[PDB]
Amino acid sequence: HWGYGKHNGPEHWHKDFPIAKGERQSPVDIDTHTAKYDPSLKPLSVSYDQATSLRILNNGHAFNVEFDDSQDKAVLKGGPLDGTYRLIQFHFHWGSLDGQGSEHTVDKKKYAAELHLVHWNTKYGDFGKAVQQPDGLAVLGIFLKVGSAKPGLQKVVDVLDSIKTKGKSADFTNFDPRGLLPESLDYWTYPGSLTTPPLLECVTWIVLKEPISVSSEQVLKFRKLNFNGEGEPEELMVDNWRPAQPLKNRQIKASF
Ligand SMILES: O[n+]1ccccc1S
Ligand SMILES: [Zn+2]
């Protein structure tokens, strides 16, 4: 029964998921004066031209926009990565107020939200096998700040009313995730974990330096979602973010 409240939030997760206190937990604070440029990093390649979205689901924690990952249609390669990583879903974490919401922080700065584009390493055949491997996933993290509207997010915003409560889904075909990307692909990378239970330590994190801007009306529609199921008392889906975790013996590298 994990969640984001007092009684079931991040400080409780370690009881059911002891890896919460592990050596490679995410998110982390990115100290820009400690992260070092790595000339060994190869160019990052985001190839989303043939992406095939299918559906959007409120899972009681966030919403997932799901993709057809039965073939190499939307892949992430290059940068720190060896091989090919297939896009399976994206989701966001966000706050109740514009001053909080992101999971990663940059010199302790919190953004209003954070987008996670989740990809799995095709050498392991499926997502479920990939998450049991230290290089099984690659998550592209993108910060959201409140300013101008993001045209490419509006199709997402406008379907949320149809998936207000936990367990609801809606058809969501022909959504282009390229429209959620900032101009620059300058990034930081480090080894980490899923930021939700089961908190598996399988992720190569790639966190873009340049945030995207979204409008206050857009993020306000995120905040109208519900953690609860239909017919239950309303608990707004806000502050579904885990705070920064100890860096331990890890290196954050910069691509720039
Ligand atoms: O929050 N989250 C859920 C699933 C896979 C990755 C991540 S970051
Ligand atoms: Zn996430």
- List phi, psi (to 5°) of 146: -90, 120
Alpha-carbon span 150 to 247, nearest angstrom? 32
The answer to whether the beta carbons of residues 117 and 67 sit under 8 Å apart is no
Domains in the chain: boundaries? 1-256
Q: Which residues are catalytic?
A: 61
Could you tell me if the CB of 195 is within 6 A of ligand 1? Answer: yes
Alpha-carbon span 236 to 166, nearest angstrom? 11
Q: Which experimental technique did the depositors report for determining this structure? A: X-ray
The amino acid occupying position 77 is K
Could you tell me if the CB of 196 is within 6 A of ligand 1? Answer: yes
**Number of Cα atoms under 13 Å in the Cβ half of residue 148:** 6
Nearest residue to 44 (alpha-carbon basis) of 163, 158, 185: 185
The answer to whether the beta carbons of residues 67 and 115 sit under 8 Å apart is no
- List phi, psi (to 5°) of 122: -65, -15
The answer to whether the beta carbons of residues 136 and 201 sit under 8 Å apart is no
Q: What's the gap in Å between 89 CA and the centre of ligand 2?
A: 10
- Kind of pairing between the strands at 137-146 and 203-208: parallel
Cα angle: 181, vertex 169, 10; to 5 degrees: 70
Could you tell me if the CB of 194 is within 6 A of ligand 1? Answer: yes
SS (H, E, C) the chain: CCCCCCCCCHHHHHHCCHHHHCCCCCCCEECCCCCEECCCCCCEEEECCCCCEEEEEECCCCEEEEECCCCCCCEEEECCCCCCEEEEEEEEEECCCCCCCCCCEECCECCCEEEEEEEEEHHHCCHHHHCCCCCCEEEEEEEEEECCCCHHHHHHHCCHHHHCCCCCEEECCCCCHHHHCCCCCCEEEEEECCCCCCCCCCEEEEEECCCEEECHHHHHHHCCCECCCCCCCCCECCCCCCCCCCCCCCCCEECC
Atom of ligand 1 nearest to the CA of 62: 1
Alpha-carbon span 14 to 124, nearest angstrom? 28
- Kind of pairing between the strands at 44-47 and 137-146: unpaired
Query: Which of 59, 139, 201, 245 for a ligand 1 pocket mutation test, highest count of atoms within 8 Å of Cβ?
Result: 139
The amino acid occupying position 62 is A
Cβ neighbours for 231, distance < 8 A, ≥ 6 positions apart: none
Could you tell me if the CB of 146 is within 6 A of ligand 1? Answer: no
Q: What's the gap in Å between 194 CA and the centre of ligand 1?
A: 5
The amino acid occupying position 33 is H
Span 1-256: which CATH code? 3.10.200.10
The answer to whether the beta carbons of residues 128 and 102 sit under 8 Å apart is no
In the beta sheet, which residues pair with residue 121? 85
Q: What's the gap in Å between 42 CA and the centre of ligand 2?
A: 25
Cβ neighbours for 177, distance < 8 A, ≥ 6 positions apart: 48, 51, 53, 65, 74, 87, 90, 117
